[PDB]
Amino acid sequence: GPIRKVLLLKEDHEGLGISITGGKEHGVPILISEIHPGQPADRCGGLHVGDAILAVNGVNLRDTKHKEAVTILSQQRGEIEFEVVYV
C-alpha cells in the first residue's frame, strides 16, 4: 500500500473519532479499527478501517507500545497530519 498523508481538523472538545488496536507489544502496527460517524476522522474522509498509523504530526509510531501511541495521539490539537498505509 502507498503511504498517504492525511490532514484532519479537530476542535478541542472532540476526539479524533477513531478506535485503534495493535502496537509494538502486539507485534502489529497501530491499526484503525473503527471510524466514528460525525467525528473528525469521518469528516476528513481519508482514513479508513484497516489503515495502519505509521506516524502522527511527525511522531513515528511504528515501534511504540499501544498506550504510548494512545497518549501521543490524544495530545494532538487542531490540524493533525496522519501518515498511514492500508494493510
Binding site: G15, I18, S19, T21, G22, E34, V70
Partner: peptide, 7 residues
Amino acid sequence: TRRETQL
C-alpha cells in the same frame, strides 16, 4: 483479551 482504545 484484546486491546482497543477509542480516541
